[PDB]
Design a protein around this nucleic acid. Sequence first.
RNA 1: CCCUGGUGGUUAAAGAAAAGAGGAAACACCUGUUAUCAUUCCGAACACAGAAGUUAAGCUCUUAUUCGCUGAUGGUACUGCGAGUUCGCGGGAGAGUAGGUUAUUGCCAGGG
Length: 50
Amino acid sequence: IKRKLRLQLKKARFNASRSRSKNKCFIKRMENNRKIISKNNINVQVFLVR
RNA sequence: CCCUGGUGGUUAAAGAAAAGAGGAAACACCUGUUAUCAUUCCGAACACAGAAGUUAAGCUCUUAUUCGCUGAUGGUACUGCGAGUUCGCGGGAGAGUAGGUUAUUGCCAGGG
């Protein structure tokens, strides 16, 4: 099988193998962060997670 | 203060064309080349000497926006970033369209 195609295919399969549950957790976190940022003049605690 | 003439600032056509209104003052057209001046020839422009006449033109004002110029709100193109992917967040045209536009203003002189 040709190397160009198999590299494309392997990369596409890795990309597509993401879990919707994890995506939903990330979406929930993003929504929470945007809601907090929408505020103004409050003390906020920032954790680094990535 | 206002009209007119001259001189600045504020730059969005503060643009040209067509039609109408005036001209007291001011301005312009207009008179003569003969005096200094100018033209690669020509008082046309300019230069000089003056006021007989006029709104015709330039100019000012009023006009349909006829040409131009300017321009929405949305939408789209495009773009930053993202463990949401033809998506999530942020910014947002050009063009087109509803429209709008023939300025405004500081201070010198003449007199209404």
